[PDB]
Design an enzyme around this catalytic site. Structure first.
Site, PDB file in Angstrom:
ATOM      1  N   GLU A  57      -3.930  -2.856   5.697  1.00 22.24           N
ATOM      2  CA  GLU A  57      -5.052  -2.562   6.587  1.00 22.24           C
ATOM      3  C   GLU A  57      -5.863  -3.822   6.891  1.00 22.24           C
ATOM      4  OE1 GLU A  57      -6.538   0.419   3.809  1.00 22.24           O
ATOM      5  OE2 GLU A  57      -6.516   1.898   5.427  1.00 22.24           O
ATOM      6  N   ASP A 103      -8.872  10.212  -5.636  1.00 18.77           N
ATOM      7  CA  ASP A 103     -10.024  10.176  -4.725  1.00 18.77           C
ATOM      8  C   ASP A 103      -9.763  10.887  -3.386  1.00 18.77           C
ATOM      9  OD1 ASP A 103      -8.349   8.321  -3.527  1.00 18.77           O
ATOM     10  OD2 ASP A 103      -9.660   6.594  -3.871  1.00 18.77           O
ATOM     11  N   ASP A 157      -4.694   2.930  -3.071  1.00 19.83           N
ATOM     12  CA  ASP A 157      -4.953   1.572  -2.574  1.00 19.83           C
ATOM     13  C   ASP A 157      -3.978   0.569  -3.177  1.00 19.83           C
ATOM     14  OD1 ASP A 157      -7.159   3.323  -2.508  1.00 19.83           O
ATOM     15  OD2 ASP A 157      -8.558   1.678  -2.136  1.00 19.83           O
ATOM     16  N   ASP A 203     -11.734   4.673  -9.001  1.00 22.75           N
ATOM     17  CA  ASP A 203     -11.084   3.961  -7.909  1.00 22.75           C
ATOM     18  C   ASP A 203     -10.031   3.037  -8.508  1.00 22.75           C
ATOM     19  OD1 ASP A 203     -10.573   1.749  -5.947  1.00 22.75           O
ATOM     20  OD2 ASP A 203     -12.031   2.857  -4.744  1.00 22.75           O
ATOM     21  N   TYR A 223     -18.937  -6.980  -3.107  1.00 28.57           N
ATOM     22  CA  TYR A 223     -18.878  -6.905  -1.633  1.00 28.57           C
ATOM     23  C   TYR A 223     -19.824  -5.875  -1.007  1.00 28.57           C
ATOM     24  CZ  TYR A 223     -15.599  -2.859  -1.169  1.00 28.57           C
ATOM     25  OH  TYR A 223     -15.006  -1.615  -1.181  1.00 28.57           O
TER      26      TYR A 223
HETATM   27 MG   LIG Z   1     -13.465   5.769  -3.864  1.00 30.54          MG
HETATM   28 MG   LIG Z   2      -8.549   4.908  -3.049  1.00 27.36          MG
END
Ligand SMILES: [Mg+2]
Ligand SMILES: [Mg+2]
Ligand SMILES: [Mg+2]
Ligand SMILES: [Mg+2]
Ligand SMILES: [Mg+2]
Ligand SMILES: [Mg+2]
Ligand SMILES: [Mg+2]
Ligand SMILES: [Mg+2]
Ligand SMILES: [Mg+2]
Ligand SMILES: [Mg+2]
Ligand SMILES: [Mg+2]
Ligand SMILES: [Mg+2]
Lengths: 163, 160, 163, 160, 160, 160
Positions: free
Chosen positions: E9, E53, E58, E90, E127
């Site tokens: 992404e 999540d 990710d 996460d 961030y």
């Molecule tokens: Mg999350």
């Molecule tokens: Mg995620």
């Protein structure tokens, strides 16, 4: 006859790239095939002609001369001025050299002799050498043919695609 | 640990062959490479050296991000690329940033991946293929000791 | 006669820039004069010919056709193929069109007719319009002349520099 | 507060005029601009609209950094550039990122600096100067209310 | 050995946070980051997975050169970044290119330099510092086995 | 109104920390940053000044487009970033282009958006987080008058 050939090229790899991208012919997704093993970069924008099937089972390869690169997946209406013929580890491969269709800034390029010799040599040099450091890869022949041969091959590949 | 300043002329990825004029300090575009190749590392020369080819000793610097043409980088040698072309010897010292702990694991030529060394060699063997009369007779990698002795000799020749 | 004119060009502004850079003729420092007020970008690499003095008190301006831009301060050995003549708020200004010297990829460009018409029109369009949104700036004339006129002006400017 | 999705076709600074084919979704290089000009803002169209020119309504988006061609940006209108060329009307809605507090100070057309509005106008007036038969008859800026009414009309025409 | 397709992404070096809309496959600009930071690796998600999540799992991919938003890369896991923030757990799987011998020296989390791992952690910890209502409770690196376990969990949740 | 020449060392967006050697005028790579951060504005120093830290007085310049390392920009001060770190005081003058009417709306520190000022502060507070022996005790924005006072101090120290 008087009515010039044109077609759509899908650019997969912008000029100057060492990332070898591929556009999937079914999904249209862009994939990174690999980072090149040699310190070389694509000499022109590189891709394939839409709605064709070359003798290697893929859409017919295309090289497009541009004033500025595009990005992977972009369509460019183009016209042929020549063709690069080569033989490597997977057999024959043909790549049609093109310029943008209907752009007067390219009217002076009508056939393979209108491209500076050193520029054609540079393109050849890329394909002869870019897999030099990959095991089991080799090139046994490479040469340039003219617009008429290019157009004949494009027409054949249109026919194979329809079949 | 030997350390010297390298003036980078050509950032990694460039097909424009920039060159510093050593008389005046100006940056010149020598040529756009005739082959579809690009410098595999940041490339330049070691300040205050005089090599066997009559010019400052060439240097290659491994970096996480290229610099701009003309930028100085404090560097230390980890090996040397030795070649012979149509004119004679043309050594290029391979370096990493000096004083940077992210490069402490690279001390000698065996610490640089073969893939990277092979790509650097491929560049210098082939980049002038399309220029008449240019060819490479020999091209080999040698170790830090070899690099250091050559740098030392080139420093002395600059002083003499 | 048979021995072609060449000279060194110092590029101040790479092709595609909206930042208008200047190289100081005494110190060699690069300065940002201004960000352009129009949505335009330099059509070619732009700079001046070393060791010349044009009729405007500055080194003679040069436009250089390149396959890839350089950066501000870079020297390029070049040869003239034409000249752009204009009149603006500060009077006459001349800009010599050039290509790299000793590069066979530019051998086909020997005079102003060898550059595609639309490319010359594009260069003209830049200089006619780039100060459109700056108060008190205007252009009253702009045209192209050939290599012979260009070379005559370069020779005159070499002479003025010596004096 | 009106909000809609803009598909950016052309990032700020581009001389390549990319265009989405609305039948297929592909990105096409329509042309390399014949003038030495570059898009003054990120440029594209509003999804699910049908303008008076038969195409989706064009949109300009102010951003701190350009995006890539094909990227969606949730946006809200702050004004509209109204022009008339050789073919008729060709409205372009000026927008900022929706839901982003860094743009809350831009609510209507008076909140955008005149220098920026003048440069945008200059682009659309001149970018096709070198194409025969292309010219601009009128070119004016109008406010958010005007923009919103036109977006609403174009949304309805898309549904019909 | 386990491998999968990662859709990138956000290329390394970006301050624009792009996201794929997983219903349509379109790329969207989520936001320009509020901090002067840039993604330390190419960033995306593993295709045909469902993290706990509710989004695709990710992925961070180490590369010699970044790609474009939307590009597929065949990858294999060497570790995982585990974080707990305002919205809970996460996980981000750290990967290298699959079938590429230049990455064969990286088999587990200990093969990635601490300076790179620390920089990656620093990005995700900081961030969102200038966005209200955001914070991180924990941030930790785990090994290949744990990474592969989570990929398998996420493959199963996608099928369910 | 006060104005001066700023030499830009580091363009906005850089993770390479360039510095001018003030004896020679050469650009040097100090280091690649250890954090995943990038300079939030073009960054450099005011020519013919001497700060209390013994270096030329630092300057941050707001621009619509970044420049190259080494480029001179005529600028005027609108505020100053005051910091105290491991090596004591550190002042960085915030500037805009001089004689450019597009920046006339910025006359003092309140005319710069808080989101930009906060991002700039965040950079300098965090960019050396992963370098040992570094820390910041204070970081604060002051107005144009204080900035101009420090420029004048630094002009006097250069002459002395
Ligand atoms: Mg999350
Ligand atoms: Mg995620
Ligand atoms: Mg084949
Ligand atoms: Mg083929
Ligand atoms: Mg040498
Ligand atoms: Mg003048
Ligand atoms: Mg002049
Ligand atoms: Mg329209
Ligand atoms: Mg927070
Ligand atoms: Mg200081
Ligand atoms: Mg200090
Ligand atoms: Mg610290």
């Amino acid at each position: 006859h008087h009515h010039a050939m044109q077609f759509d090229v899908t650019i997969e790899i912008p000029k100057g790239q060492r990332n070898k991208y591929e556009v999937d012919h079914e999904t249209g997704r862009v994939r990174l095939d690999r980072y090149l093993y040699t310190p070389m970069a694509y000499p022109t924008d590189y891709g394939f002609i839409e709605d064709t099937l070359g003798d290697d089972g893929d859409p017919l390869d295309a090289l497009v001369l541009l004033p500025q690169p595009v990005f992977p997946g972009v369509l460019v209406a183009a016209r042929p001025v020549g063709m690069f013929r080569m033989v490597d580890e997977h057999g024959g491969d043909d790549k049609v050299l093109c310029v943008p269709a209907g752009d007067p800034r390219w009217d002076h390029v009508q056939d393979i002799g209108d491209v500076p010799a050193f520029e054609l040599d540079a393109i050849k040099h890329f394909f002869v050498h870019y897999k030099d450091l990959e095991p089991g890869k080799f090139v046994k022949a490479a040469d340039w043919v003219d617009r008429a041969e290019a157009e004949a091959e494009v027409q054949r590949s249109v026919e194979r695609f329809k079949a």
